[PDB]
Amino acid sequence: TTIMAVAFKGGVVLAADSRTSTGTYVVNRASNKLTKLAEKIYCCRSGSAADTQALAEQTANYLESYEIDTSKPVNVTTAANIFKKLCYMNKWNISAGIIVAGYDPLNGGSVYSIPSGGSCVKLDYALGGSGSIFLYSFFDANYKTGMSKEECVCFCQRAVAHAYSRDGSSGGLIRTIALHQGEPEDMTIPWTKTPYCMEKDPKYRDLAVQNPPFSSSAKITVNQSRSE
Amino acid sequence: TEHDQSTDIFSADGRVFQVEYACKAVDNGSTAVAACCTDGVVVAVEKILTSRMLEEGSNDRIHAVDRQAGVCICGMLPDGRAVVSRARAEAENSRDVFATPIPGSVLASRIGEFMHVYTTHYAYRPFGCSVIIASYADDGPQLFVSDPSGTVAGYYGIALGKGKTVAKTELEKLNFKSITCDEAVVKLTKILHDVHDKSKDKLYELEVAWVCNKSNCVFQHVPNDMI
């Protein structure tokens, strides 16, 4: 999996790849890892799908009850704390890494990481899943504060694509969603329009010279293509 | 007239008399007034002293329930106190479970629900207090009353107890769109001093608290140099 969320001024963007795998074989190539928790709060799920589906469903059930009582839209910090507690109480029984992000009028766009073990950290961006370890340096090198909604969607799409081109365990579609004072905006990019893959990157077009012909010179030139 | 011995029973007219009687405790207790202002809420109560040899701070009717919220118990004091502990558990619950200071409307709802339940089981009796709730959380200044029935209502200004019909007449002459926490502390104290009966209760002091923008939205007894 590769999940991430990024804050921009006024909102957040959440992004994810679309693959569910048993290790070597893809059982679903079109999952939806961006799960809705309330009108403007979503989470990005990584780890066991069974666990993170059950905890998201449970977190959503609690927040809908709380919003009816209070009669108010719910703040991101509430979503994050409810989830966190579920992730902490069950830490030994699950495999889950979660990102909760959202928009609310009191604190704007916010992002919480809730990794394995059930800590909860409030950030400007968060990465998660197996594919995350390829993006730290990407973000360190290329990410900036101050990005608009449109810059941030585009940047997320390009990060996911970099991750999933090198991570065997990520791949497929790129889904995003942008949450802000206006209406939720979702987007799905098919693999055939991905902004990056190694298959289309010109520095990987020409093949390594692993198979030179039997020759009378130590000079290396081209791969042998036809029998002698 | 066996119909008035348990609160698990309607009377033939649809009344619940155990709850009426408990309301009578409140109506014969001491007089409290409150005011919801532009910048906060102020409460004032009159403590009838049973003895000149009490330390000051004895039988306090105003208690903090959370950093930003407090209650003034009118009626029987120990009943009121059980209501204060529930109110604190609720306030704590909201910070623990939902990461938010409890909203004032929600805290009052939960107090009502709590008082209501002792109106329905043969084994318990209604509470013999009303509880004024004063809050100033993300929903702004709020003043609610819960009563022994469990009815909860929001107010701009209010008065409970024996003086309450006159105090209500004076609270009607205020102006609730302008008045501040500083002016109210003065005016409410004047109303408790006028509705006070001198024949019957010779020893009293006034208690007064507030949650305002001055106090950095912390519920607290007002500093004693302002009466």
Short mmCIF file of C-alpha atoms in Angstrom, two decimals:
data_model
loop_
_atom_site.label_atom_id
_atom_site.label_comp_id
_atom_site.label_asym_id
_atom_site.label_seq_id
_atom_site.Cartn_x
_atom_site.Cartn_y
_atom_site.Cartn_z
CA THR A 1 0.00 0.00 0.00
CA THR A 2 1.00 3.61 -0.41
CA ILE A 3 -1.15 6.17 1.47
CA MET A 4 -0.55 9.77 2.28
CA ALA A 5 -2.22 13.02 3.29
CA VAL A 6 -1.09 16.55 2.83
CA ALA A 7 -2.25 19.81 4.29
CA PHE A 8 -2.81 22.89 2.18
CA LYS A 9 -4.24 26.23 3.14
CA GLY A 10 -7.88 25.61 3.74
CA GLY A 11 -7.92 21.80 3.49
CA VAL A 12 -6.26 18.48 2.99
CA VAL A 13 -5.66 16.04 0.20
CA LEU A 14 -5.70 12.30 0.74
CA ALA A 15 -4.14 9.91 -1.83
CA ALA A 16 -3.77 6.17 -2.24
CA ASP A 17 -2.86 3.37 -4.65
CA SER A 18 -5.51 0.72 -5.35
CA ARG A 19 -3.92 -2.63 -4.72
CA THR A 20 -4.71 -5.38 -2.30
CA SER A 21 -2.34 -8.25 -2.26
CA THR A 22 -1.59 -11.62 -0.60
CA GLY A 23 2.14 -10.99 -0.89
CA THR A 24 2.76 -12.12 -4.43
CA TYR A 25 -0.62 -12.18 -6.06
CA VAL A 26 -3.06 -9.32 -6.41
CA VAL A 27 -6.50 -10.24 -5.07
CA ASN A 28 -8.04 -6.85 -5.75
CA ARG A 29 -6.69 -4.34 -8.17
CA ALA A 30 -9.21 -1.60 -7.49
CA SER A 31 -9.58 -1.22 -3.72
CA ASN A 32 -10.68 1.92 -2.09
CA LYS A 33 -8.36 2.81 0.78
CA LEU A 34 -9.84 6.26 1.24
CA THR A 35 -12.66 5.60 3.66
CA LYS A 36 -15.25 8.15 4.74
CA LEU A 37 -15.67 8.78 8.54
CA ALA A 38 -17.86 11.93 8.35
CA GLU A 39 -18.85 14.43 5.70
CA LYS A 40 -15.34 16.02 5.75
CA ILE A 41 -13.23 13.53 7.57
CA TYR A 42 -11.63 10.55 5.84
CA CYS A 43 -9.03 8.04 6.65
CA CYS A 44 -6.40 6.25 4.59
CA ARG A 45 -6.13 2.58 5.53
CA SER A 46 -3.00 0.46 5.43
CA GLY A 47 -2.27 -2.98 6.80
CA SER A 48 -4.78 -5.78 7.24
CA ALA A 49 -7.87 -4.84 5.29
CA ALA A 50 -10.12 -6.83 7.67
CA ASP A 51 -8.85 -4.85 10.71
CA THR A 52 -8.91 -1.37 9.14
CA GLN A 53 -12.37 -1.86 7.63
CA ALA A 54 -13.69 -2.90 11.08
CA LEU A 55 -12.00 0.02 12.91
CA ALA A 56 -13.11 2.59 10.35
CA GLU A 57 -16.68 1.36 10.45
CA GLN A 58 -16.61 1.57 14.22
CA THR A 59 -15.08 4.99 14.27
CA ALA A 60 -17.77 6.21 11.84
CA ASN A 61 -20.58 4.79 13.89
CA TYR A 62 -19.34 6.73 16.96
CA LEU A 63 -18.91 10.01 15.13
CA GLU A 64 -22.40 9.96 13.60
CA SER A 65 -23.91 9.46 17.10
CA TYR A 66 -21.78 12.28 18.48
CA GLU A 67 -22.82 14.65 15.70
CA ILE A 68 -26.52 14.00 16.36
CA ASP A 69 -26.13 14.69 20.08
CA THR A 70 -24.04 17.81 19.70
CA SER A 71 -25.98 18.86 16.54
CA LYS A 72 -22.65 20.13 15.13
CA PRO A 73 -20.10 18.98 12.51
CA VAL A 74 -17.29 17.11 14.12
CA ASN A 75 -13.73 18.22 14.40
CA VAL A 76 -10.89 16.26 13.03
CA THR A 77 -9.22 15.85 16.42
CA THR A 78 -12.26 13.95 17.69
CA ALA A 79 -12.07 11.50 14.77
CA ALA A 80 -8.42 11.09 15.33
CA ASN A 81 -8.77 10.44 19.08
CA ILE A 82 -11.57 7.95 18.77
CA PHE A 83 -9.62 5.97 16.16
CA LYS A 84 -6.31 6.24 18.06
CA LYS A 85 -7.90 4.70 21.13
CA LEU A 86 -9.26 1.77 19.14
CA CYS A 87 -5.82 1.33 17.59
CA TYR A 88 -4.13 1.48 21.02
CA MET A 89 -6.51 -0.85 22.86
CA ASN A 90 -6.16 -3.50 20.17
CA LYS A 91 -2.51 -2.99 19.32
CA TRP A 92 -1.45 -6.63 19.88
CA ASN A 93 -4.35 -8.12 17.87
CA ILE A 94 -4.20 -6.01 14.65
CA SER A 95 -1.95 -4.86 11.83
CA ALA A 96 -3.02 -1.26 11.08
CA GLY A 97 -1.45 2.02 10.02
CA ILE A 98 -3.97 4.87 9.69
CA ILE A 99 -4.07 8.47 8.58
CA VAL A 100 -7.02 10.59 9.59
CA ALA A 101 -7.48 13.86 7.83
CA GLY A 102 -10.20 16.24 7.42
CA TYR A 103 -11.52 19.75 7.34
CA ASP A 104 -13.38 21.47 10.10
CA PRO A 105 -14.13 25.20 10.62
CA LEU A 106 -12.33 25.56 13.98
CA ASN A 107 -8.89 24.23 13.00
CA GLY A 108 -9.02 24.11 9.16
CA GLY A 109 -7.31 21.13 7.46
CA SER A 110 -5.55 18.63 9.72
CA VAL A 111 -3.65 15.47 9.39
CA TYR A 112 -2.98 12.85 12.03
CA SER A 113 -0.73 9.84 11.62
CA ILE A 114 -1.67 6.86 13.70
CA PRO A 115 0.95 4.16 13.11
CA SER A 116 1.25 0.64 14.46
CA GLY A 117 1.33 0.68 18.24
CA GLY A 118 -1.36 3.39 18.42
CA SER A 119 0.50 6.65 18.83
CA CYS A 120 -1.06 9.79 17.35
CA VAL A 121 0.89 12.59 15.78
CA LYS A 122 -0.36 15.81 14.26
CA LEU A 123 1.49 16.81 11.14
CA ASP A 124 1.59 18.82 7.94
CA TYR A 125 1.90 15.59 5.94
CA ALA A 126 1.85 11.92 6.64
CA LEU A 127 3.01 8.86 4.74
CA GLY A 128 2.03 5.28 5.38
CA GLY A 129 2.03 1.73 4.07
CA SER A 130 4.88 -0.31 2.61
CA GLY A 131 5.29 2.18 -0.18
CA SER A 132 5.94 5.04 2.26
CA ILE A 133 9.66 4.29 2.69
CA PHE A 134 10.22 5.34 -0.96
CA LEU A 135 8.65 8.80 -0.45
CA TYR A 136 10.48 10.33 2.60
CA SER A 137 13.30 11.58 0.37
CA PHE A 138 10.84 12.56 -2.34
CA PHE A 139 9.03 14.84 0.07
CA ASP A 140 12.23 16.12 1.69
CA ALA A 141 13.54 17.05 -1.78
CA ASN A 142 10.38 18.17 -3.62
CA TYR A 143 7.58 19.06 -1.18
CA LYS A 144 6.90 22.62 -0.15
CA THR A 145 4.55 24.39 2.18
CA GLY A 146 2.07 26.92 0.75
CA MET A 147 0.76 24.68 -2.06
CA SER A 148 -2.77 25.33 -3.38
CA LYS A 149 -5.38 22.63 -3.64
CA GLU A 150 -4.48 21.99 -7.30
CA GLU A 151 -0.75 21.84 -6.65
CA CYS A 152 -1.33 19.46 -3.78
CA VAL A 153 -3.58 17.03 -5.72
CA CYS A 154 -1.08 16.91 -8.51
CA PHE A 155 1.87 16.48 -6.14
CA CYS A 156 0.10 13.61 -4.31
CA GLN A 157 -0.65 11.86 -7.61
CA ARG A 158 2.97 12.07 -8.57
CA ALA A 159 4.21 10.81 -5.17
CA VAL A 160 1.90 7.82 -5.22
CA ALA A 161 3.10 6.96 -8.72
CA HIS A 162 6.74 7.13 -7.71
CA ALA A 163 6.04 4.87 -4.77
CA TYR A 164 4.04 2.30 -6.62
CA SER A 165 6.54 2.02 -9.50
CA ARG A 166 9.14 0.61 -7.13
CA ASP A 167 6.98 -1.09 -4.50
CA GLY A 168 5.87 -4.60 -5.57
CA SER A 169 3.07 -4.33 -3.00
CA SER A 170 1.44 -1.15 -4.45
CA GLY A 171 -0.01 -0.44 -7.84
CA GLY A 172 -3.14 0.05 -9.92
CA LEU A 173 -5.24 3.19 -9.77
CA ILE A 174 -4.37 6.39 -7.99
CA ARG A 175 -7.37 7.69 -5.97
CA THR A 176 -7.42 11.10 -4.36
CA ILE A 177 -9.83 13.21 -2.36
CA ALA A 178 -9.69 16.91 -1.46
CA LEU A 179 -11.51 18.16 1.61
CA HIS A 180 -12.02 21.88 2.37
CA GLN A 181 -14.91 24.24 3.14
CA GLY A 182 -16.57 23.39 -0.21
CA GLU A 183 -17.80 20.01 -1.57
CA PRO A 184 -15.57 16.87 -1.44
CA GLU A 185 -13.66 16.28 -4.68
CA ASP A 186 -12.59 12.73 -5.59
CA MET A 187 -10.46 11.70 -8.49
CA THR A 188 -9.27 8.36 -9.84
CA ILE A 189 -6.34 8.13 -12.29
CA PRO A 190 -5.97 4.86 -14.32
CA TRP A 191 -2.58 3.23 -14.60
CA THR A 192 -2.50 4.13 -18.32
CA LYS A 193 -2.46 7.86 -17.43
CA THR A 194 -0.09 7.61 -14.45
CA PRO A 195 2.26 10.59 -14.25
CA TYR A 196 5.27 8.34 -13.67
CA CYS A 197 6.29 4.83 -14.43
CA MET A 198 9.61 3.17 -15.11
CA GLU A 199 8.11 1.56 -18.26
CA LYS A 200 7.77 5.01 -19.88
CA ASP A 201 10.79 6.74 -18.34
CA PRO A 202 13.43 7.22 -21.09
CA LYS A 203 16.44 6.47 -18.89
CA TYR A 204 15.20 2.88 -18.58
CA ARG A 205 14.40 2.32 -22.25
CA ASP A 206 17.74 0.81 -23.39
CA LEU A 207 18.49 -2.58 -21.86
CA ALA A 208 21.47 -3.46 -19.70
CA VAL A 209 24.17 -5.32 -21.50
CA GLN A 210 23.99 -8.60 -19.64
CA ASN A 211 24.10 -10.85 -22.71
CA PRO A 212 26.94 -9.82 -25.04
CA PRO A 213 27.85 -12.16 -27.93
CA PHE A 214 30.80 -14.47 -27.89
CA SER A 215 33.55 -12.22 -29.26
CA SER A 216 37.22 -11.88 -29.92
CA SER A 217 37.39 -8.57 -27.90
CA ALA A 218 36.72 -7.59 -24.30
CA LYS A 219 34.79 -4.60 -25.65
CA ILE A 220 31.11 -4.55 -24.66
CA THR A 221 28.58 -3.06 -27.04
CA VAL A 222 25.12 -4.64 -27.36
CA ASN A 223 23.08 -7.60 -26.19
CA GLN A 224 23.06 -10.55 -28.60
CA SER A 225 19.60 -10.52 -30.30
CA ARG A 226 19.88 -13.41 -32.83
CA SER A 227 21.52 -16.83 -32.89
CA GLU A 228 24.86 -17.19 -34.62
CA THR B 1 -54.32 8.79 48.15
CA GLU B 2 -51.90 5.84 47.82
CA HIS B 3 -50.85 7.38 44.50
CA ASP B 4 -48.15 9.60 45.98
CA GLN B 5 -45.71 7.26 47.64
CA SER B 6 -43.51 6.11 44.75
CA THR B 7 -42.40 8.04 41.71
CA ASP B 8 -42.98 4.97 39.51
CA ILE B 9 -46.74 5.78 39.37
CA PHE B 10 -48.94 8.25 37.57
CA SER B 11 -51.78 9.78 39.44
CA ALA B 12 -55.16 9.72 37.69
CA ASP B 13 -54.64 13.24 36.28
CA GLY B 14 -51.30 12.34 34.72
CA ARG B 15 -49.14 13.93 37.44
CA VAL B 16 -46.14 12.43 39.23
CA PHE B 17 -46.48 13.71 42.80
CA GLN B 18 -43.17 12.44 44.15
CA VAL B 19 -41.61 14.80 41.61
CA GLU B 20 -43.84 17.69 42.63
CA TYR B 21 -42.83 17.30 46.28
CA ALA B 22 -39.13 17.25 45.52
CA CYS B 23 -39.67 20.50 43.60
CA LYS B 24 -41.08 21.89 46.82
CA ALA B 25 -37.73 21.36 48.57
CA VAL B 26 -36.10 23.62 45.95
CA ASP B 27 -38.82 26.27 46.27
CA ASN B 28 -38.22 26.56 50.05
CA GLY B 29 -34.40 26.57 49.81
CA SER B 30 -32.23 29.68 49.51
CA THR B 31 -32.44 32.14 46.56
CA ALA B 32 -29.91 32.02 43.63
CA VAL B 33 -29.72 34.37 40.61
CA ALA B 34 -27.81 34.12 37.31
CA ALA B 35 -27.25 36.18 34.14
CA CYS B 36 -25.90 35.27 30.69
CA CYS B 37 -23.90 38.24 29.45
CA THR B 38 -21.96 39.29 26.36
CA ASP B 39 -18.61 38.14 27.74
CA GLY B 40 -19.62 35.29 30.06
CA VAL B 41 -21.97 34.02 32.74
CA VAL B 42 -22.36 35.13 36.35
CA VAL B 43 -24.06 33.20 39.20
CA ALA B 44 -24.84 34.41 42.71
CA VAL B 45 -26.24 32.46 45.58
CA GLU B 46 -27.24 33.31 49.12
CA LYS B 47 -25.94 30.92 51.77
CA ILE B 48 -28.13 30.83 54.89
CA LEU B 49 -25.66 30.25 57.74
CA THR B 50 -26.72 27.82 60.44
CA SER B 51 -24.03 29.07 62.93
CA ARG B 52 -21.64 32.01 63.42
CA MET B 53 -18.78 29.56 63.95
CA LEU B 54 -18.50 28.20 60.39
CA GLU B 55 -15.24 28.66 58.53
CA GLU B 56 -15.69 30.61 55.28
CA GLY B 57 -16.13 28.29 52.31
CA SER B 58 -18.46 25.98 54.24
CA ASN B 59 -21.47 24.51 52.43
CA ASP B 60 -20.45 26.06 49.09
CA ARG B 61 -23.24 25.80 46.55
CA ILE B 62 -21.07 26.58 43.50
CA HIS B 63 -18.73 23.97 42.17
CA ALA B 64 -16.46 23.75 39.11
CA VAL B 65 -17.23 20.85 36.82
CA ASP B 66 -14.56 21.49 34.21
CA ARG B 67 -12.05 24.18 33.41
CA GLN B 68 -14.82 26.13 31.66
CA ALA B 69 -18.02 25.09 33.43
CA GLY B 70 -19.66 25.20 36.83
CA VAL B 71 -22.90 24.49 38.70
CA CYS B 72 -24.84 26.22 41.41
CA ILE B 73 -26.94 23.82 43.52
CA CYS B 74 -30.23 25.21 44.82
CA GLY B 75 -32.28 22.99 47.09
CA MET B 76 -30.90 20.23 49.21
CA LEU B 77 -27.10 20.48 49.16
CA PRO B 78 -25.97 16.78 49.39
CA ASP B 79 -28.36 15.76 46.59
CA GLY B 80 -26.85 18.53 44.59
CA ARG B 81 -23.44 17.14 45.24
CA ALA B 82 -24.19 13.78 43.62
CA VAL B 83 -25.21 15.73 40.57
CA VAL B 84 -21.83 17.56 40.63
CA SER B 85 -19.92 14.30 40.55
CA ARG B 86 -21.84 13.06 37.53
CA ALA B 87 -21.37 16.36 35.78
CA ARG B 88 -17.61 16.05 36.28
CA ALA B 89 -17.55 12.49 34.94
CA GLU B 90 -19.39 13.72 31.87
CA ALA B 91 -17.02 16.62 31.43
CA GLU B 92 -14.06 14.23 31.81
CA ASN B 93 -15.58 11.74 29.43
CA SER B 94 -15.83 14.37 26.75
CA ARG B 95 -12.11 15.23 27.05
CA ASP B 96 -11.04 11.61 27.35
CA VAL B 97 -13.14 10.05 24.65
CA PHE B 98 -13.89 12.90 22.23
CA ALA B 99 -10.98 15.33 22.80
CA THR B 100 -13.24 18.33 23.28
CA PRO B 101 -14.32 20.43 26.25
CA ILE B 102 -17.96 19.50 26.72
CA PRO B 103 -20.37 21.95 25.09
CA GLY B 104 -22.65 23.69 27.56
CA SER B 105 -25.85 22.45 25.87
CA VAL B 106 -24.60 18.89 25.95
CA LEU B 107 -23.52 18.98 29.60
CA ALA B 108 -26.97 20.31 30.55
CA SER B 109 -28.62 17.57 28.46
CA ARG B 110 -26.68 14.89 30.30
CA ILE B 111 -27.49 16.30 33.74
CA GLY B 112 -31.19 16.39 32.88
CA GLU B 113 -31.02 12.80 31.63
CA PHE B 114 -29.46 11.87 34.97
CA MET B 115 -32.00 13.61 37.13
CA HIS B 116 -34.76 12.13 34.97
CA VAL B 117 -33.88 8.57 35.69
CA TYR B 118 -34.44 8.89 39.44
CA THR B 119 -37.99 9.83 38.39
CA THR B 120 -38.89 6.46 36.98
CA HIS B 121 -37.84 3.59 39.29
CA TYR B 122 -39.77 2.49 42.38
CA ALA B 123 -36.46 2.01 44.30
CA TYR B 124 -35.13 5.63 44.09
CA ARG B 125 -36.47 9.08 44.70
CA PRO B 126 -36.16 12.29 42.73
CA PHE B 127 -33.36 14.70 43.63
CA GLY B 128 -34.30 17.61 45.79
CA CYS B 129 -32.23 20.25 44.07
CA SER B 130 -32.21 22.26 40.88
CA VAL B 131 -28.87 22.74 39.16
CA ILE B 132 -27.87 25.99 37.38
CA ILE B 133 -25.27 25.22 34.69
CA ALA B 134 -22.96 28.00 33.56
CA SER B 135 -20.57 27.32 30.73
CA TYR B 136 -18.37 29.02 28.22
CA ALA B 137 -16.94 26.45 25.80
CA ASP B 138 -16.75 26.60 21.96
CA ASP B 139 -20.52 27.24 21.86
CA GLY B 140 -20.17 30.60 23.72
CA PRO B 141 -21.81 31.73 27.07
CA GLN B 142 -24.60 29.43 28.16
CA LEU B 143 -26.85 29.27 31.20
CA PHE B 144 -29.12 26.25 31.72
CA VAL B 145 -31.30 25.04 34.64
CA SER B 146 -32.06 21.36 35.26
CA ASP B 147 -34.78 20.59 37.82
CA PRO B 148 -35.87 17.44 39.78
CA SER B 149 -38.12 16.38 36.87
CA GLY B 150 -35.11 16.44 34.54
CA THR B 151 -36.40 19.26 32.43
CA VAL B 152 -33.61 21.41 31.04
CA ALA B 153 -34.06 24.90 29.68
CA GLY B 154 -31.73 27.67 28.59
CA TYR B 155 -32.01 31.15 29.91
CA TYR B 156 -30.73 34.68 29.63
CA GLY B 157 -31.30 35.28 33.32
CA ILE B 158 -32.93 33.27 36.12
CA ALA B 159 -33.77 33.03 39.83
CA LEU B 160 -34.55 30.00 42.01
CA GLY B 161 -35.69 29.46 45.60
CA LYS B 162 -37.86 31.36 48.05
CA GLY B 163 -37.05 34.86 46.83
CA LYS B 164 -37.57 33.85 43.22
CA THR B 165 -40.76 35.76 42.35
CA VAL B 166 -39.39 39.16 43.31
CA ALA B 167 -35.85 38.43 42.00
CA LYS B 168 -37.49 37.55 38.62
CA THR B 169 -39.20 40.97 38.54
CA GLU B 170 -35.79 42.72 38.97
CA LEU B 171 -33.94 40.49 36.49
CA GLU B 172 -36.60 41.65 33.98
CA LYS B 173 -35.37 45.28 34.19
CA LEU B 174 -31.82 44.33 33.04
CA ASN B 175 -30.71 44.48 29.40
CA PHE B 176 -29.19 41.22 28.23
CA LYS B 177 -27.73 42.44 24.92
CA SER B 178 -25.39 45.00 26.57
CA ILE B 179 -24.69 43.90 30.12
CA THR B 180 -21.20 42.68 30.99
CA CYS B 181 -19.86 40.32 33.65
CA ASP B 182 -18.54 43.29 35.67
CA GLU B 183 -21.91 45.11 35.76
CA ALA B 184 -23.85 41.89 36.52
CA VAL B 185 -21.75 41.04 39.60
CA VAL B 186 -22.95 44.35 41.00
CA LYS B 187 -26.62 44.06 39.98
CA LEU B 188 -27.21 40.45 41.00
CA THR B 189 -25.65 41.13 44.39
CA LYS B 190 -28.06 44.03 44.88
CA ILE B 191 -31.03 41.76 44.08
CA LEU B 192 -30.01 39.09 46.57
CA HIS B 193 -29.60 41.78 49.26
CA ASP B 194 -33.15 43.12 48.64
CA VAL B 195 -35.08 39.83 48.44
CA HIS B 196 -33.36 38.73 51.66
CA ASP B 197 -35.75 38.16 54.60
CA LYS B 198 -34.27 39.55 57.83
CA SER B 199 -36.90 38.21 60.27
CA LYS B 200 -36.25 34.56 59.41
CA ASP B 201 -32.57 34.16 58.30
CA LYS B 202 -30.30 36.46 60.33
CA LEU B 203 -26.96 34.96 59.25
CA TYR B 204 -26.10 34.78 55.56
CA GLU B 205 -23.28 35.34 53.10
CA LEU B 206 -23.27 35.65 49.32
CA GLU B 207 -21.35 33.32 47.05
CA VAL B 208 -20.65 34.53 43.47
CA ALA B 209 -18.84 32.92 40.54
CA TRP B 210 -18.20 33.48 36.89
CA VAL B 211 -16.81 32.33 33.61
CA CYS B 212 -15.90 35.29 31.44
CA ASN B 213 -13.19 36.52 28.97
CA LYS B 214 -11.48 38.28 31.90
CA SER B 215 -10.96 34.96 33.75
CA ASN B 216 -9.54 33.49 30.51
CA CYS B 217 -12.77 31.42 30.26
CA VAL B 218 -12.06 29.60 33.55
CA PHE B 219 -14.97 29.00 35.90
CA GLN B 220 -14.04 30.42 39.30
CA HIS B 221 -15.34 32.18 42.43
CA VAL B 222 -15.07 35.94 41.90
CA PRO B 223 -12.26 37.61 43.94
CA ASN B 224 -13.79 38.65 47.30
CA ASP B 225 -12.97 42.37 46.83
CA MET B 226 -15.86 43.06 44.42
CA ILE B 227 -19.10 43.04 46.45
#
